[PDB]
Design a protein around this ligand. Structure first.
Ligand code: NA
Lengths: 330, 330
């Protein structure tokens, strides 16, 4: 972040040809992008989304209506361009990458697939540690690797996506843990809800004060959630603007944040998911969602949908000032 | 609007590879787009926004902090690409056309400008009829002409924009007259507030039974507002998805709706303006705003920012179904 650029950008903003605060929330977004890129007139282009996929042992708790096999079937769907993320990406000038860090089952070699399976799904987080600290570290590096490939190929904006049946439970556990919240706050039918909350509570019961973020993630998180933390850390270190998607993706962002506080300066909330716990995550991060379309899919869809808005926000500072355009002021 | 397609699209949506209702409000948008185009798999591309500009005699009532000259100066800004609308259009693959139906002062010939000045601004709507029915007709037709060129040049979705100092007062008067609302509901320093409400009340007082929508608009509206109705009427007849911008633009759409009841089915609310009366207009139209960014600028900015969302929505139906992708269900 460039303090000087921000100040210069703030001055220009106050001189652009539009009434004060007429572009609402987008004005703040533009100023942040200016400081982030160190340019008074920021500019975004081709974007990229790295969808991290992995399975969860907690599916044994009956926390999902879908069979575990859906995770792998969806990854194939991604590679063939039939998922929602593929379609939104086409409409948002965003490249799509897929990362396998823990899907149950073999996947074929494919141009858009990065195969770094750490293990065939995590252990049941309700009965014990989802993974070992070493496996967590491997997932983290995998996420960083994927992100680095996206960046190397020209990504100017980076978002993360998630795919994993039952990852909302793991997301809830990681969130409740990192934000010191109760199950009921991160888990919003009746009996499935019962299983999810109890699953989260049991997982939290294994934790204790003084634990590092990655240690907590390895205990109650998911492999793709840790990989997502890696995706964001790599993007952050690259100096790129980062876009948040839904609940599971944001949980991964919270992990990255706890590992690097300054990362929050590069975060932009793409949307507000229907997932109740998403609100708490955003408030903790002090971020306002750009979109609110009652989305509840994940895959990085909400993040990708917001990219055009971020590009538009950056262009605001490209507007003419009253002096440049010869426009009279109040 | 094809009911058969709407039904077929609704069926495909329910079978796409994602949880039911997982894509929230965008699913309804997709279905409407499919029905409008008469294709289960709608496709959108280049968009266009026609920004109608004209001055208002009501500025004499002290209803704006900006001098009247700003309308003409902003039109020049549009032609030089320094306005917010130009920046947003760049990020949303949307052509920008400007239509002068009543700006005070001369403008240079320009390929992106349609010069159809009806008169140098309207008369003061608080003291008498803003324009004659004959002038309103010319403004309406100028709007159709500009929209037709946008369409002839390839627009697949159409939005209207407004530029006119003091037009929120004319928009309030027209809205109140068409919807039968009081000045208090449509109008939003306190002294300015008060004079705007009085201006609106005065205009309404001149109305009487037996007046056609065009006669009403001529009496209390603005030239660009009537032109905006023409833009939407032309887009409606061309069978295109139409996108609403802010308060003044939506006032123009209400006029078009009153002249053509079925036009409402082609409308999409781009965003929710900070202008108090905007929500009332959208409620009267029964439309849900896609964006809510606290924008209060106009120019068609909100509508243009929503175009990428409309394109994304159309692509949803291009996703693979469970059966097509070989994904198990739940
Ligand atoms: Na008079």
């Amino acid at each position: 972040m460039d303090p000087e650029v921000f100040a210069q950008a703030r001055l220009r903003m106050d001189q652009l040809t539009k009434p004060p605060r007429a572009l609402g929330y987008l004005e703040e977004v533009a100023l942040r992008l200016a400081a982030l890129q160190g340019r008074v007139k920021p500019e975004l282009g081709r974007g990229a989304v790295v969808v991290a996929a992995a399975d969860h042992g907690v599916v044994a708790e009956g926390v999902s209506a879908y069979p575990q096999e859906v995770t792998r079937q969806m990854v194939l769907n991604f590679l063939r361009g039939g998922a929602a993320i593929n379609q939104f990406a086409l409409a948002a000038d965003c490249a799509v990458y897929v990362l396998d860090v823990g899907v149950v089952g073999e996947l074929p070699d494919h141009p858009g697939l990065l195969k770094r399976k750490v293990r065939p799904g995590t252990a049941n987080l309700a009965q014990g540690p989802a993974m070992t600290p070493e496996e967590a570290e491997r997932a983290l590096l995998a996420g960083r690797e994927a992100a680095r490939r996206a960046i190397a190929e020209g990504a100017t904006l980076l978002a993360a996506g998630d795919m994993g049946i039952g990852n909302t439970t793991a997301a809830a556990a990681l969130t409740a843990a990192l934000l010191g919240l109760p199950p009921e706050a991160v888990v919003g039918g009746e009996e499935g809800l019962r299983r999810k909350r109890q699953a989260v509570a049991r997982a939290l019961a294994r934790l204790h004060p003084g634990m590092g973020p990655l240690e907590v993630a390895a205990e109650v998180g998911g492999l793709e959630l840790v990989a997502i933390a890696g995706i964001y850390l790599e993007g952050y270190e690259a100096g790129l603007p980062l876009v948040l998607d839904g609940f599971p993706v944001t949980a991964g962002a919270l992990l990255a944040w706890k590992m690097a506080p300054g990362l929050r300066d590069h975060l932009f909330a793409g949307h507000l998911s229907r997932e109740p716990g998403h609100r708490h995550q955003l408030e903790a991060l002090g971020l306002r969602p750009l979109l609110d379309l009652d989305l509840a899919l994940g895959e990085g869809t909400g993040a990708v949908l917001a990219m055009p808005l971020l590009r538009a926000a950056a262009r605001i500072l490209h507007m003419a000032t009253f002096q440049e355009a010869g426009v009279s002021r109040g």
